[PDB]
């Protein structure tokens, strides 16, 4: 003990250092997160657009200057305003998953008191690379 290094695949942020969560675990945690007053949104990102970059610094004269790139996620049609049904979210995750094999799909939510967004579970795509 102990060889530590992500082999062939990388650590895609929060909840990637633990074994993957199932849809039942995700739905139970969503139902709790909804109960606690957070508002979910379903979002997705291309594989080279979900992994942090600074290449765009080439266009700009003052860098690093807190600037970042390739961490922005695109929203799947609607945020969960009004209806909070987790099976609608699960069908939308499947529809998103069917639409993009090369892009990652993730859930995020916000606390409207300070209007702050939480980036949650789980980084997933049909072509998901090596398990740790």
């Amino acid at each position: 003990m102990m060889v530590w290094t992500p082999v062939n695949n990388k650590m895609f942020e929060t909840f990637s250092y633990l074994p993957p969560l199932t849809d039942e675990q995700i739905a139970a945690q969503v139902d709790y997160i909804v109960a606690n007053g957070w508002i979910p949104c379903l979002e997705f990102a291309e594989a080279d657009k979900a992994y942090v970059s600074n290449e765009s610094a080439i266009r700009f004269g003052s860098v690093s200057c807190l600037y970042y790139d390739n961490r922005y996620w695109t929203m799947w049609k609607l945020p969960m305003f009004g209806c909070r049904d987790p099976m609608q979210v699960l069908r939308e995750i499947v529809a998103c998953t069917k639409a993009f094999p090369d892009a990652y799909v993730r859930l995020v939510a916000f606390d409207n008191q300070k209007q702050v967004q939480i980036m949650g579970f789980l980084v997933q795509r049909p072509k998901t690379a090596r398990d740790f």
Partner: protein, 469 residues
């Protein structure tokens, strides 16, 4: 008198000149609440009034020349005072000052007037500051946090669980490539943010400039090779303001995200100027704090935590340091939770059960984020998460640099424990009682956490409740 009074020689009774227990405050008035014990023989209203008189006007013999200034509505006023139940000679004094007496948002003038002049008197045995009313027109001429919690959440590009880190030790003198190796491995292992200490910044042989260049190589790859957003809090300490400005400007060239400074152990106006600069250059600013057994713990005899939290937020900072739990800073429920509430939240009235005697009106005041550090890891994560939630910015001192499998499995174990605790918290578990079994289950296959829990099998402390000043 509004000016032009021919006062007879001597000193008039302070209870006949600076005491008004029927006073009606203005929205522009500055108020201060103090806990005091007079020397034996002096009436407490004579003492309270004398404190109000000396911090407003001052005298050692008054004649017609004291009639030259406009006194009327412009002089300080002592309001009704009360006894303290814990000690018979202790009283709470309440003093009002108008806006007319102070320069607008002037921190050394306010500090010298309110604390400097007041906390001196030889006929006063002990005096403790309990609260302050800062009117809106002085709050907004102050600047507050440059990039507070509702800014910092969108600026750091990540959030939804606590922010995981570690304090880099030994404090003495670690070589730049071995420091580069340790920082790289713990960030690549799963820490979000790492932190420097004062001696880690600069040493006789080694300049901050070159330590920073090893940080620059390390931070580029400690994002680039991991995908996840991470960084490192540079601590940036210095002897002169020219050196402070040089340290600022050379790191402006690289424009790194969040740094910290201990600058507010250096001086109040140094930190205020930096916060203005940080606002101007769009930074994020972490504020250090120390001197806990000579400032923060001034029992019945000076500074207290709630006034410290108000004073710290009324200079400003985006992150602010904050209990070590054990060792050198606070860890108590009746100390920390008020202190954090006064930093996190806006628009909330005064309450004597929370030791708040005054409300400073609120609305549009940024929040500021506590940074704890964090002397015990794995078994005290349940209580820490249940008490503080998604506050902190937890910079470990035992974790990471205490794991005999090295910095990456150390950081990975701390990261695994945070994610496992956050999964338990996401399921709504009864965390104080479930958390030991959550850790035992997590240890089945994270081997790194199993090693963390064999290595740290003697630490079980939670928090104490009652202040230990």
């Amino acid at each position: 008198t509004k000016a032009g009074a021919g006062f007879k020689a001597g000193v008039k009774d302070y209870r006949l000149t600076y005491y008004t227990p029927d006073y009606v405050v203005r929205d522009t008035d500055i108020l201060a609440a103090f806990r005091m014990t007079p020397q034996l023989g002096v009436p407490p209203e004579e003492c309270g009034a004398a404190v109000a008189a000396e911090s407003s006007t001052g005298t050692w013999t008054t004649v017609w020349t004291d009639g030259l200034t406009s006194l009327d509505r412009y002089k300080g006023r002592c309001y009704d005072i009360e006894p303290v139940p814990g000690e018979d000679n202790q009283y709470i004094a309440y003093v009002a000052y108008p806006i007319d007496l102070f320069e607008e948002g002037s921190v050394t003038n306010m500090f010298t007037s309110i604390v400097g002049n007041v906390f001196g008197f030889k006929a006063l045995r002990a005096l403790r500051l309990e609260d302050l009313r800062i009117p809106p027109a002085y709050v907004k001429t102050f600047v507050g946090p440059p990039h507070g919690i509702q800014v910092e959440r969108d600026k750091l590009n990540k959030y939804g669980r606590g922010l995981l880190g570690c304090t880099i030790k030994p404090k003495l003198g670690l070589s730049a490539k071995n420091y580069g190796r340790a920082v790289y491995e713990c960030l690549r292992g799963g820490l979000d943010f790492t932190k420097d200490d004062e001696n880690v910044n600069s040493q006789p042989f080694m300049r901050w400039r070159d330590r920073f260049l090893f940080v620059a190589e390390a931070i580029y790859k400690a994002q680039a090779e991991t995908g996840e957003v991470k960084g490192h809090y540079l601590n940036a300490t210095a002897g002169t303001c020219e050196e402070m400005m040089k340290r600022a400007v050379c790191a402006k060239e690289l424009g790194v995200p969040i740094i910290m400074h201990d600058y507010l152990t250096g001086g109040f106006t140094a930190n205020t100027s930096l916060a203005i600069y940080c606002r101007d250059n769009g930074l994020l600013l972490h504020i250090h704090r120390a001197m806990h057994a000579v400032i923060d713990r001034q029992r019945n005899h000076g500074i207290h935590f709630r006034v410290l939290a108000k004073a710290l937020r009324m200079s400003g900072g985006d992150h602010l340091h904050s209990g070590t739990v054990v060792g050198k800073l606070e860890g108590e429920r009746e100390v920390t939770l008020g202190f954090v509430d006064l930093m996190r939240d806006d628009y909330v009235e005064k309450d004597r059960s929370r030791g708040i005697y005054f409300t400073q009106d609120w609305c549009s005041m940024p929040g500021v984020m506590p940074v704890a550090s964090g002397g015990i890891h794995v078994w005290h994560m349940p209580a820490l998460v249940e008490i503080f939630g998604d506050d902190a910015c937890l910079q470990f001192g035992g974790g990471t640099l205490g794991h005999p499998w090295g910095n990456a499995p150390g950081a990975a174990a701390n990261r695994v424990a945070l994610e496992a605790c956050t999964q338990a918290r996401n399921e709504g578990r009864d965390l104080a009682r479930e958390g030991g079994d959550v850790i035992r289950s997590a240890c089945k296959w994270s081997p790194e956490l199993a090693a963390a829990c064999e290595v740290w099998k003697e630490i079980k402390f939670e928090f104490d409740t009652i202040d230990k000043l």
